[PDB]
Amino acid sequence: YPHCLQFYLQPPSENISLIEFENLAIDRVKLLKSVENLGVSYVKGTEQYQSKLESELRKLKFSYRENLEDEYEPRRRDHISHFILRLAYCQSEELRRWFIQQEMDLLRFRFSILPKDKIQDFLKDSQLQFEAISDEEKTLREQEIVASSPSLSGLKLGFESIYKIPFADALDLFRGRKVYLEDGFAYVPLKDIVAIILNEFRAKLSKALALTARSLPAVQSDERLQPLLNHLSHSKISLDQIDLLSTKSFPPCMRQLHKALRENHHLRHGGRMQYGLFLKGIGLTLEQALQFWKQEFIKGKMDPDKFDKGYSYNIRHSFGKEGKRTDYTPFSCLKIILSNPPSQGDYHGCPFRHSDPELLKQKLQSYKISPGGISQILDLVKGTHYQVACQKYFEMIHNVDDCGFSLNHPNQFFCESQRILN
Amino acid sequence: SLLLLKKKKYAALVVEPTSDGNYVTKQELKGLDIVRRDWCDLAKDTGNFVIGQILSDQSRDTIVENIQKRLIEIGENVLNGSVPVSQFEINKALTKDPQDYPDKKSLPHVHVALWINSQGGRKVKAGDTVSYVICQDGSNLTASQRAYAPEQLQKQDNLTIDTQYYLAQQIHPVVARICEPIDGIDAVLIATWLGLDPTQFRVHHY
Amino acid sequence: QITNIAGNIMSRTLMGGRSERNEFLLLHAFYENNYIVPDKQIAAYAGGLVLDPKVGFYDKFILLLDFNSLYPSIIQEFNICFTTVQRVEQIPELPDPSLEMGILPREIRKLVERRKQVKQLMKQQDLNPDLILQYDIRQKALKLTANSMYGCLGFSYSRFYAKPLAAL
DNA sequence: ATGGTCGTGCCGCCAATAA
Numbered sequence: 014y015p016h017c018l019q020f021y022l023q024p025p026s027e028n029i030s031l032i033e034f035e036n037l038a039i040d041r042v043k044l045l046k047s048v049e050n051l052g053v054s055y056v057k058g059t060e061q062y063q064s065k066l067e068s069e070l071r072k073l074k075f076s077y078r079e080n081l082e083d084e085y086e087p088r089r090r091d092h093i094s095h096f097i098l099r100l101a102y103c104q105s106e107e108l109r110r111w112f113i114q115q116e117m118d119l120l121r122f123r124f125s126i127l128p129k130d131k132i133q134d135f136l137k138d139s140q141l142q143f144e145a146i147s148d149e150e151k152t153l154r155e156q157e158i159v160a161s162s163p164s165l166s167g168l169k170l171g172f173e174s175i176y177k178i179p180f181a182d183a184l185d186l187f188r189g190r191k192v193y194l195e196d197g198f199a200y201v202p203l204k205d206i207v208a209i210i211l212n213e214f215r216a217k218l219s220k221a222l223a224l225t226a227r228s229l230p231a232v233q234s235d236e237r238l239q240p241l242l243n244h245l246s247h248s249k250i251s252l253d254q255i256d257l258l259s260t261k262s263f264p265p266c267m268r269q270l271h272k273a274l275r276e277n278h279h280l281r282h283g284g285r286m287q288y289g290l291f292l293k294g295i296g297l298t299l300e301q302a303l304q305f306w307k308q309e310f311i312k313g314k315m316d317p318d319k320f321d322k323g324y325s326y327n328i329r330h331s332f333g334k335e336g337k338r339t340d341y342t343p344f345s346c347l348k349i350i351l352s353n354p355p356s357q358g359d360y361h362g363c364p365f366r367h368s369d370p371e372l373l374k375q376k377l378q379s380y381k382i383s384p385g386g387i388s389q390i391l392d393l394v395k396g397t398h399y400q401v402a403c404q405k406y407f408e409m410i411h412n413v414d415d416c417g418f419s420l421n422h423p424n425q426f427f428c429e430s431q432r433i434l435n
Numbered sequence: 436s437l438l439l440l441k442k443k444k445y446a447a448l449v450v451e452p453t454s455d456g457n458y459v460t461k462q463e464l465k466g467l468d469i470v471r472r473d474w475c476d477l478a479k480d481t482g483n484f485v486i487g488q489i490l491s492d493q494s495r496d497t498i499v500e501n502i503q504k505r506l507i508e509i510g511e512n513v514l515n516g517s518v519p520v521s522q523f524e525i526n527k528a529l530t531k532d533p534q535d536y537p538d539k540k541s542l543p544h545v546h547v548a549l550w551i552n553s554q555g556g557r558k559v560k561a562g563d564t565v566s567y568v569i570c571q572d573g574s575n576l577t578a579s580q581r582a583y584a585p586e587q588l589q590k591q592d593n594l595t596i597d598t599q600y601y602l603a604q605q606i607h608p609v610v611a612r613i614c615e616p617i618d619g620i621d622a623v624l625i626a627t628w629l630g631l632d633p634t635q636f637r638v639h640h641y
Numbered sequence: 642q643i644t645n646i647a648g649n650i651m652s653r654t655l656m657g658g659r660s661e662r663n664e665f666l667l668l669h670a671f672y673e674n675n676y677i678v679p680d681k682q683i684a685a686y687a688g689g690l691v692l693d694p695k696v697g698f699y700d701k702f703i704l705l706l707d708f709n710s711l712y713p714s715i716i717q718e719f720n721i722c723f724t725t726v727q728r729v730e731q732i733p734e735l736p737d738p739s740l741e742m743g744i745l746p747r748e749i750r751k752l753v754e755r756r757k758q759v760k761q762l763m764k765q766q767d768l769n770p771d772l773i774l775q776y777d778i779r780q781k782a783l784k785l786t787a788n789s790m791y792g793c794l795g796f797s798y799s800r801f802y803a804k805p806l807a808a809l
Numbered sequence: 810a811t812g813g814t815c816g817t818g819c820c821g822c823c824a825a826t827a828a
């Protein structure tokens with residue numbers, strides 16, 4: 014009922030539309046990502062931090078200060094959002110800690126904004142069994158508490174209330190002889206109760222995350238939820254334009270390989286070698302090549318250790334930095350046509366040869382190729398004239414009558430394309 | 436009933452007659468990972484339980500549920516720490532003298548052998564066996580370079596048992612190789628049951 | 642018992658090793674029949690065949706048929722011996738069946754017969770549980786002694802090295 | 810100081826030839 018901060022238990026039972034299902038997940042992801050920026054760029058006590066975080070919480074329709082009754086909608090929004098996001102960030106151990114840290118930070122912020130006097134009811138509304146002490150009891154034990162106080166300076170027992178807790182729940186405190194124990198009950202200042210509340214929330218959150226992961230295969234059976242569970246961590250020459258080149262200058266084979274890497278977040282050995290050598294051919298160095306491959310493989314939900322000890326050696330050797338130290342030339346188009354035929358699960362090879370016309374037709378169609386050009390390319394392919402067909406593809410996508418060169422190497426394709434484009 | 440895995444690898448029940456047409460059954464193994472000395476006792480016991488369940492006369496439905504329950508219990512108990520230290524030992528025999536190994540860095544058992552020679556008493560020579568356990572050191576080296584002696588764990592303080600290694604490289608491979616010919620069980624299912632991350636083993640396509 | 646079978650010194654028996662026992666056994670066998678032995682010194686051939694299995698689970702009954710003392714039986718059957726088989730990676734041809742038995746099969750027959758004698762005692766009813774294990778160890782040791790005679794034929798440092806015999 | 814056949818876990822190494 015205090016919908017402005019809530020220990021997340023009792024999963025909901027309402028039903029919602031799928032559009033709202035995706036909107037809640039994306040909004041929660043956005044807010045939780047911005048919590049990272051606010052916690053990194055600033056410090057935990059400035060007024061600007063509070064102002065920015067509360068303004069963003071207002072922007073995305075999320076619950077804040079309890080003084081205005083019926084904000085039932087933000088309560089429902091947050092309640093559904095946490096549980097929907099529990100399914101995604103429970104897979105990899107690099108994401109569970111990221112979820113827990115920022116959710117604890119958000120709960121700390123929400124706790125710091127409770128005015129002064131609605132805290133007591135909340136403690137009973139979260140199954141915590143805590144208590145307060147009256148003024149006469151505070152005066153009775155004033156000297157005892159201030160003597161039992163931590164390195165906190167001064168004897169002045171301020172207006173901050175003192176809370177009464179079972180001793181077993183204050184393990185982190187009485188171990189260091191920093192609180193007062195009487196009749197099996199610990200007395201704590203209001204400052205230190207935040208630590209125990211967050212520490213007790215963390216264990217329950219981790220237990221809930223673990224118990225959801227092992228019963229999550231049953232939920233993957235639904236075909237409508239696959240994009241959500243796998244794309245919440247999805248998304249001279251530099252790194253930040255290669256995608257554009259995929260549409261503009263790459264030949265169909267290497268464009269297909271780039272699309273495969275973008276979508277599946279993995280590639281087989283033949284595609285790896287071919288694309289890596291071409292990508293060296295365009296001009297990349299070792300550092301950004303390693304950056305590119307590791308960035309494309311981490312999105313496959315694998316930690317950097319596996320990539321570093323598995324693929325880094327081959328990637329480095331491709332450029333000639335280990336072994337005989339031999340630098341290699343990108344594959345000639347003839348070997349792409351004739352060597353290492355593709356199989357199931359593989360995307361390498363020449364599309365104009367290995368792909369059947371019943372697939373090559375829509376492969377041309379998806380690339381905005383004119384139907385007359387499509388028919389001409391199909392006729393050329395049927396005649397086993399592949400290079401001239403690839404040249405015709407280049408002319409059609411470049412809007413020129415004749416290219417002016419003989420093509421035998423995809424790097425030549427890229428260089429000729431960039432000669433006129435740039 | 437016979438489970439044949441590969442060449443020189445099969446488990447079976449042998450029929451022993453007693454009298455008047457009555458016969459008992461005795462479990463026998465040939466070539467499995469449970470009969471070798473280079474695997475921890477934990478993985479061998481789990482594999483023995485799985486073999487005993489598969490070769491039983493029960494319906495094929497009940498055995499999968501029993502395996503799931505037992506694997507969940509193992510996954511909880513390993514992280515809980517209720518299993519004694521002595522069941523985390525791996526025993527390997529030495530062929531040449533420990534000082535003669537050129538690849539001493541990359542082999543765990545010889546690494547333990549040089550230590551036990553260099554500080555201890557009785558010197559281990561060719562033909563002797565060495566027991567080693569993989570523990571957490573915190574220096575961010577590979578698993579094969581983090582071998583420690585059985586007595587090196589109960590004496591020092593900074594070391595603790597590496598549950599990830601024994602749960603993803605000791606238990607999982609044995610039960611994955613055993614249940615290959617049977618249907619309904621796969622590597623990803625065992626990974627989820629044990630509480631591991633499925634992303635490493637097979638997955639991939641979204 | 643092993644030292645009384647091979648004829649070597651008893652102290653060498655307790656140190657293990659299977660080449661020395663075979664060396665002395667063949668030395669006694671050849672010296673008894675008025676021969677001259679070679680002087681002391683101052684994978685390599687095709688092995689067994691394993692069939693392609695059919696991986697999986699079987700609920701029905703399965704028979705398993707096994708040969709008794711395969712390689713010694715082959716040696717006794719085809720009269721495989723140093724004297725009877727010509728030699729110089731090539732498989733020699735089988736010898737003529739009219740010629741009498743050689744030195745090797747007569748000596749391996751005794752080991753086979755001793756193992757068969759031990760198994761008959763093992764067959765007896767109402768035996769002490771420790772006695773049955775002792776007899777099992779005895780028959781295993783005799784089986785290894787019988788099967789090491791074939792292995793010594795392919796040891797490059799043996800006094801009686803002969804690759805073609807093992808190949809055959 | 811017996812022979813051979815089979816599988817499982819760690820490492821390093823290689824292909825390439827337009828312009």
Ligand SMILES: Nc1ncnc2c1ncn2[C@H]1C[C@H](O)[C@@H](COP(=O)(O)OP(=O)(O)OP(=O)(O)O)O1
Binds near residue numbers: 711785788789
């Ligand atoms: N340790 C060994 N050394 C050399 N050859 C061996 C050894 N073990 C087995 N062999 C060879 C020779 C044997 O004739 C053959 C088959 O052995 P195996 O099946 O164990 O027994 P076996 O056929 O000699 O009879 P048995 O069943 O009576 O023990 O393999």
Ligand code: SF4
Binds near residue numbers: 264400
């Ligand atoms: S002809 Fe050569 S460059 Fe063109 S798509 Fe085929 S492999 Fe690529």
Ligand SMILES: [Mg+2]
């Ligand atoms: Mg690989």
Ligand SMILES: [Mg+2]
Binds near residue numbers: 707708709711
């Ligand atoms: Mg046999």
